[model samples]
Target: GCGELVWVGEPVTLRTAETITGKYGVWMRDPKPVYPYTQETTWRIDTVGTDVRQVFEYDLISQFMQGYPSKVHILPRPLESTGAVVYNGSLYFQGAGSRTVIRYDLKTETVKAEKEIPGAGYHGQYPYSWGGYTDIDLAVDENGLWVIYSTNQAKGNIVLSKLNPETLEVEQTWETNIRKQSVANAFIICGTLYTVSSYTSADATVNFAYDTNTGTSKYLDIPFKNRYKYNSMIDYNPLERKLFAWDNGHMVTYDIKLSK
Candidate 1:
């Protein structure tokens, strides 16, 4: 809990989603959760089809797996793909077919903030190898809100940008040598970036890591499994101290080990 992630345990099969579109989706909770939603609360977005914008809110993970959502929210704009996160009562996601990141305030149910990342590729450029126009992935971790994407000028290398959670403005940026389209997806944990090697491999590794604390990067051999063999999204949550993944219609969490 006080160091960079060193190991990720076996995929704990929480529950399989009960919808056809569950084949490809992103399900997550706020790393720093707010009131009205507890650690039990889970939110999901099925990104199988184009113009995706529905966020299924589950009061409990059991409800999500049971095919009953406490509330289903249709966003003001369609989401680009599976890179969505709920943080501090706001739903952050990439806008469909664009480089814009929109923040929807949950309480007011209005578009509170929006910002277009400069030089960000859109509509298929630099997406996760599994696709979904998944460029500009939004993430929340111990440090806070972040945006990961490849720029036209960067030539596909991943760019990690720390964002101001309230204003939706970029605070700092780190350009890594890791190519965005080469990996499945990435998540931020304690200001470090972790990337999985493959989206379809039953056994994949958290092959690369970038430490923003030192602005350095390393290659890791930590084993990570894609149990369903079609893991499209993976993100880490600080509250639960576990990594969450959306695998071919199933949502699961992994008990991760962090170095001391």
Candidate 2:
């Protein structure tokens, strides 16, 4: 009950991304950052180039707001979609056109480990409604690492997996009936999955929720906004208790209220 989202606050625009490519990308801060990277540090990527490997690291929100990245790191492999995540000093993302996930060490700037999401769809096979090749989305919550995906056997429904953060292997999997392509996007909070109805709706609602604790699912109508009308990525930050989103070319955050 602690993580059930009961209310979503108004969307706040932090700073519009400085690049045209930034129109569809991800900007987020690590909830449980490793040493050397504090809560003030943020990371971003313009997931639009032929080689989507540049990661912009900022020391503070002010630096990002001013379009100043302290350091930019290049990844060993090009990532796909806006589902890439920085967690525990590593970058987690699905390889381009592949279901295999790669963990790129931020400190060492090397590929730490890679593993395939068994039978998971990749490329445009089961992407979200917006369709940016976002088939296998990597997410982290208060509970740890998770993957939101769909397999052939799952028939386009969401196939959730808890991942071993170290080896990038599947720990356990849960099957939900929410069709992957039906929702604009999805995220995990406290082991629960929430889906958005539309990516470009000014007043889209948090459509459906599936709780891993109960292995049960339900639908709800909690107002969620896409102010810029072309939101590409959104993920929960347990540390800030907020939702970091990429809206059009703007990097935004939403304060969400959870059940006590």
Candidate 3:
């Protein structure tokens, strides 16, 4: 998506006249298994229509944790179809049940138990709905795992909770104003969590720069509209000090000055 190749050790620049747009899925998945409907939401990427490809696909029936079923689709489309975090030579992701977070050890080629995210799809949407969005949207910092996921009781509030990868313990639960039904995922940098909420009907987006240390959140302008494809929005490289994200058809970057 870059019109200009990035230079090493230099600030990332927006290729104004050279913006590139890539396309992705336009349909929506029904998070509720009881519901018998899947809506197709169409949008363009850089003025071009594109097909959804498996950028990275896996056979879930073969790779699920031992206690899970062999059927991939039965894995709650909401709970199992979430984001992942790669840290310390391993990758962490939510289990199909939406209660457990599993860690995969790259070195030993094994998947181990990180810990369960308590109160995760159990508390429903008012008081629980007043908490974080129940989708189990997770992010990570140097310390441990965090999530802006939904509880069983809540409708749209995204509760932030701490996860200990080693012990599989969730603690320090908090909530924020960045609640949205379409929240796809989250990211943490130096204790600040960045989250994206989608607005397919309005062709726009709202982003939040959340400060975990201060227990507050502020809005960051969505530079481009409908450019990202929600789940595929964030792709940051800590070693290069670069932040790359895309939506619909727009791809962009920001310099984080990683080691400076």
Candidate 4:
């Protein structure tokens, strides 16, 4: 058996293949005269030739639009510092200011304010992603949509909130000490919400879980050290039960089975 075939409609054995080697480099691009953002950051490539060179670099996100950067709209920023979640056929994402969450109707293509989480002050006056990212965090459950995010890490608290998708209203508020000094995401199971607590040492880690019904919270200890300081988490299909984290250069998956 030399090379394993990757099939689309058939069951296949998964394997990893190593090819050329290349180094990470920063890519620079002038977005526009108004923005004129020049950023040199990490990139990846095939590196198949004798002389290692960048094969493909991380460029601007394309899925948002059909073609290239032909059109741009930078108003009503994401709710937090993460992305949006699709719940009950609706898309829920945080707006830029990080003060309000927006719900987009896919069928009618209408945007509306979902809810503004209570408890604003130091967390709001503070930046969410160390002044780097600003995509509000989101998750979903059978009951409704859940968003857990940080406005101030200096306060060392993760703000948790829920939105009733049907009415688009703020339903509840749950706080946890898991808000690390860095960026992270949150998820939900049944009526419980979970998020990674800050890393104490470089190795030790902490996470939090809150029970909405009981209004109680608990901390979870990870067995190993996390590779990335800033991480984002999400639950894939609570209907199917799976969770994952999108760490740069890595993706982690988890099973969601409640203990009896």
**Candidate achieving the largest TM-score:** 2
Q: How far off is model 4, as Cα RMSD?
A: 13.2
- TM-score for candidate 2, residues paired by index: 0.97
Per-model tally of clashing residue pairs: 1, 0, 31, 18
Candidate 4 lDDT, tens digit per residue, 146-229?
766554432646666777775667677766655433434455677776654432234433255677777777766543233444
Clashing pairs in 2: none
Query: Among these predicted structures, which one has the highest lDDT?
Result: 2
lDDT of 2 by residue, 1-260 (tens): 35589898888998887776788898888888998888888898999767788889998889988888999998788889999888888889888879999998888888889999999999999999999998988888998889999999999999999999889989999999999999999999888999999999877999999999999999899999898998899888888888989988888999999985
Q: Is candidate 2 or candidate 3 better by TM-score?
A: 2
Better of 1 and 3 by TM-score: 1
- Show the lowest summed lDDT stretch of 10 residues, model 3: 26-35
Which residue runs does candidate 1 get wrong by more than 4 Å?
A: none
The whole-model lDDT of each prediction reads 0.86, 0.89, 0.42, 0.42
lDDT-best of 1 and 2? 2
Give the per-residue lDDT digits (tens) of candidate 1, residues 38-105: 77888888888877878888988788678688998889998877788889989998888789999998
TM-score of each predicted structure versus truth: 0.96, 0.97, 0.54, 0.55
The order by descending lDDT is: 2, 1, 4, 3
